[PDB]
Amino acid sequence: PEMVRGQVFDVGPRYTNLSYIGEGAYGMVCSAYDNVNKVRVAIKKISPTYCQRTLREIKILLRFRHENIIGINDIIRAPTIEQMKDVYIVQDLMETDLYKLLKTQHLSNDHICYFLYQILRGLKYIHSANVLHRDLKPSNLLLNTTCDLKICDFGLARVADPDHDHTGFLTEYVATRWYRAPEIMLNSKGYTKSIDIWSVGCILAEMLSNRPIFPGKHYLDQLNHILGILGSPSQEDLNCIINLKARNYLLSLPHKNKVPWNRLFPNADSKALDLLDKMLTFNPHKRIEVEQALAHPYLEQYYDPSDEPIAEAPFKFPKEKLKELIFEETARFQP
Numbered sequence: 001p002e003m004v005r006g007q008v009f010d011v012g013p014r015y016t017n018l019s020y021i022g023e024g025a026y027g028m029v030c031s032a033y034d035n036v037n038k039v040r041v042a043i044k045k046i047s048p049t050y051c052q053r054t055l056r057e058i059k060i061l062l063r064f065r066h067e068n069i070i071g072i073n074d075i076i077r078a079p080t081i082e083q084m085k086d087v088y089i090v091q092d093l094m095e096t097d098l099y100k101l102l103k104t105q106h107l108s109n110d111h112i113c114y115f116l117y118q119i120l121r122g123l124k125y126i127h128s129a130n131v132l133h134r135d136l137k138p139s140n141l142l143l144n145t146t147c148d149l150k151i152c153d154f155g156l157a158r159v160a161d162p163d164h165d166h167t168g169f170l171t172e173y174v175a176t177r178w179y180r181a182p183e184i185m186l187n188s189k190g191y192t193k194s195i196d197i198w199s200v201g202c203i204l205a206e207m208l209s210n211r212p213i214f215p216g217k218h219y220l221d222q223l224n225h226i227l228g229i230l231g232s233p234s235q236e237d238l239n240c241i242i243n244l245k246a247r248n249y250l251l252s253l254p255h256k257n258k259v260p261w262n263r264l265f266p267n268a269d270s271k272a273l274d275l276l277d278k279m280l281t282f283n284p285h286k287r288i289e290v291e292q293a294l295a296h297p298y299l300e301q302y303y304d305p306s307d308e309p310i311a312e313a314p315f316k317f318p319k320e321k322l323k324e325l326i327f328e329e330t331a332r333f334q335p
């Protein structure tokens with residue numbers, strides 16, 4: 001087997017001349033030459049006790065088929081459960097991701113507009129399958145050399161469940177802190193489509209300035225960053241928060257003024273800021289939905305609902321059992 005950075009990466013003979021891309025959420029990612037399709041590809045190594053998030057992602061990505069969602073091209077594993085240890089997931093090679101790109105490149109308004117269009121196009125398909133991504137952020141948006149964009153990392157995704165979204169104040173949450181909607185900290189488990197729209201709003205703001213808009217250092221500081229720009233919520237929006245611990249927290253804070261979007265983003269297109277405002281709405285019930293965002297004047301050059309496909313149907317879902325399910329889900333790639 002070939003080795004990369006003093007670690008086995010056993011994907012041959014189909015895949016050869018490996019080069020390190022980076023570390024991913026569950027292990028090493030390398031590029032490799034695919035000797036069958038005659039293109040370089042990306043390969044993620046997953047080592048185990050496995051993680052339910054590996055299975056959830058595989059099930060979702062194998063069911064999904066969309067231009068703005070990363071596909072799984074191949075899955076490499078031993079032929080039997082007894083011999084199975086590492087699993088390698090092969091995907092299309094992508095030059096970069098939005099996190100890397102924003103560290104060093106100023107985006108043109110045309111690039112911001114096109115990127116946002118593609119994020120929302122992909123998200124429309126995800127939401128049409130009654131699935132929530134729940135961890136949208138720059139590093140989960142892959143880009144190729146022509147700036148085509150694909151959403152990745154579905155390990156925190158869930159089927160939408162608005163009737164069970166409510167929870168108490170300060171409920172622990174798993175998804176990346178800077179892209180968490182305010183309601184996560186107040187009364188939400190992140191089981192409604194509005195949580196993803198907030199993350200997209202955050203991404204849009206970050207594309208406008210190359211800096212995260214709400215870089216909280218810890219759980220409650222995330223909320224205080226948000227309120228520091230949106231200002232204090234209105235009486236009407238507070239009345240929507242029936243949880244008393246959450247409501248009384250917000251009532252305990254000093255009045256905070258709204259920061260005008262055009263003062264934070266003096267370079268931004270005015271239509272981009274009208275759409276940003278609608279995505280970063282405090283009240284999730286008032287927040288714009290994915291199809292309305294696509295129909296917003298900012299995206300008029302691209303909007304074409306006939307070319308914004310949806311899923312055919314809604315998506316639906318012990319350590320030994322988990323390993324057996326991963327083995328079964330990956331069976332189609334075996335010779």
Ligand SMILES: *CCC(=O)N1CC(O)=Nc2ccccc21
Binds near residue numbers: 024070092093151153
């Ligand atoms: C969501 C991240 C992902 O799927 N990939 C695959 C890829 O093409 N690039 C990449 C680089 C570093 C970490 C993860 C990924």
Ligand SMILES: C=CC(=O)N1CC(=O)Nc2ccccc21
Binds near residue numbers: 242
């Ligand atoms: C403190 C809760 C509260 O005032 N309301 C408003 C209501 O009108 N009815 C209602 C129904 C179910 C839950 C909460 C509520």
